[PDB]
């Protein structure tokens, strides 16, 4: 808690898409953005493009889940407000297990796919994504689903409750 401060945790398989990162950066008052994904971290070409389109005044970083736990374990970012970008709620539960503190998780968007169920206009969940959301809720963590801060906030459990019992 006396270390970095998670300004917001946005889940999105697209990371930066449209003005969602620009508007969310100014509204969230975020000057730093860290991407946690082993698949992207292994793509040097994609990392270059994301780093070259990093919004002005905002820095974008690319690290893996194991490396991310260590960056947070460094008080060098204490007080610093950083935004966490994830592609799947599974990677979020992993950070929590490492002793990372998360009060709430925001679902930005998830590419739909066959075998998955559509819960929102562009949010899909599989039996694995749902299982991770249930564990976060059981820990008292709030789960909100919303594409833009200007859109009505919905509860992840409510959307999954009207689908999965």
């Amino acid at each position: 808690n006396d270390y970095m401060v998670i300004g917001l945790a946005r889940i999105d398989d697209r990371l930066i898409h449209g003005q969602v990162a620009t508007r969310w950066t100014k509204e969230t008052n975020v000057s730093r953005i860290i991407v946690v994904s082993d698949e992207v971290a292994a793509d040097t070409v994609r990392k270059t493009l994301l780093t070259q389109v990093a919004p002005p005044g905002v820095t974008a970083h690319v690290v893996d889940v194991a490396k991310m736990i260590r960056v947070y374990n460094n008080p060098k970012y204490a007080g610093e407000r950083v935004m966490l970008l994830f592609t799947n709620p599974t990677d979020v539960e992993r950070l929590v297990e490492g002793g990372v503190k998360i009060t709430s998780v925001n679902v930005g968007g998830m590419a739909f796919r066959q075998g998955k169920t559509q819960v929102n206009n562009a949010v899909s969940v599989d039996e694995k994504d749902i299982e991770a959301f249930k564990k976060l809720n059981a820990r008292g963590i709030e789960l909100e689903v919303r594409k833009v801060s200007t859109d009505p906030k919905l509860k992840m459990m409510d959307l999954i409750s009207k689908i999965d019992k």
């Binding site: 449209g18 003005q19 508007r23 040097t44 270059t48 493009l49 070259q52 833009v148």
Partner: protein, 133 residues
């Protein structure tokens, strides 16, 4: 907020707004008009006026049009002529619309919004090209 009216030849204005709202959510204080073959600038002036009657124009009005010199542009030009806080900007594109709509909520001054719309519209035009590896 500052009022925004979008006008293009044809029926594209409504879709540019729809596209923006797909990105940002539904917008307030925004109007649009279409221009069909057979209509002239005078028809368009009436259309713009009917849209303005429904908008809050107290802080100003920004007409975003497709191209410099077309009828939509010419008609909008006749309306803003000796009006304070009225401007017409040609070359409307999604980057311009999105940035402009986002900034509008933070209550910028009229000159600030006009400058941002031109700058973001131009900076939004960019080719991918080969990328470094």
């Amino acid at each position: 907020t500052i009022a925004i009216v979008i006008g293009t030849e044809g029926w594209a204005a409504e879709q540019l707004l729809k596209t923006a709202e797909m990105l940002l959510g539904e917008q307030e204080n925004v109007g649009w008009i279409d221009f069909v073959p057979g209509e002239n600038a005078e028809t368009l002036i009436e259309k713009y006026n009917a849209q303005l009657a429904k908008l809050d124009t107290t802080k100003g009005v920004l007409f975003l049009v497709d191209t410099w010199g077309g009828s939509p542009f010419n008609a909008a030009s006749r309306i803003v002529v000796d009006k304070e806080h009225y401007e017409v900007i040609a070359g409307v594109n999604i980057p311009m619309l999105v940035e402009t709509l986002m900034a509008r909520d933070d209550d910028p001054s009229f000159d600030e919004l006009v400058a941002l719309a031109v700058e973001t519209g131009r900076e939004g035009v960019k080719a991918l090209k080969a990328k470094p590896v």
